Amino acid sequence: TELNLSHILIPLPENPTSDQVNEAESQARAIVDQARNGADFGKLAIAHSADQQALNGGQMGWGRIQELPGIFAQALSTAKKGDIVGPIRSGVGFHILKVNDLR
Amino acid sequence: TELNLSHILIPLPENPTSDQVNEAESQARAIVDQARNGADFGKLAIAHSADQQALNGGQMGWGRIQELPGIFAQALSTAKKGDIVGPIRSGVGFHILKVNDLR
C-alpha cells in the first residue's frame, strides 16, 4: 500500500499556551477548509507551512503506509485520492495532509 | 512512550538492483554487529551514515513512539536501553537505530 502525499505543518512550541494552541488550530482548520474547497495545496504550503518541504509545495512523494508516523497511519489508511486529512495534532503543531494519489 | 534514539542510514537509490540492495544490507549488518560488540555508535554514524545527523553521531533526540516511522516503532516494540535494532529497510535505504534512553 503506497501513498503520494503533501503535508503542511502549522507549528507550536514544545509547551504552548492555550491561546497559542487555539490560534494554531484555527489557522490549520482554515487551511483544511480551503484545501477541501479546491485551493492549491502547494501554494498553501509555501505560504504557511513551517516544515522543510514547504518551499516544494509540501510534496512528500511516495511511501508505504507503514513508513508513516503512527499518528498519521490510521487516519490515512481509509482515505481516498484527493482527501485532505487533519488537522492532526502532534508534539510539534497541527498537521494537514493531502492524498495526491494511492497505488 | 518516548525514546531517545541515534540513527544510521545506509542509502539506496530509488529503484535499486538486487545487487545494490544486497551490498547495502551487508554493510548495515556489519555495522549492527560492530555496534552490538561495543563500537561507539556515534563514531559509526559519523563514518557511515548518509543522513543529516551523521556528524552529530546520528543523534535524533527524544521522540514519541507514535511519531516515529511505523517501521521503526514496530522494530522498537520491545527495545531496552542500549539495544541496537536493524537493519530496517525503507524506501531510502537501510536503517540502524540505537536506544540511548527511554521513558
Binding site: 505543518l9 511516495w62 508534539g91 | 535524533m60 531510502v92
Partner: peptide, 12 residues
C-alpha cells in the same frame, strides 16, 4: 521516499 522527510518534521 517519504520515510525520513516525515521523521524530520518531529525532530527536536
Amino acid at each position: 521516499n517519504f520515510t525520513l522527510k516525515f521523521w524530520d518534521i518531529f525532530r527536536k
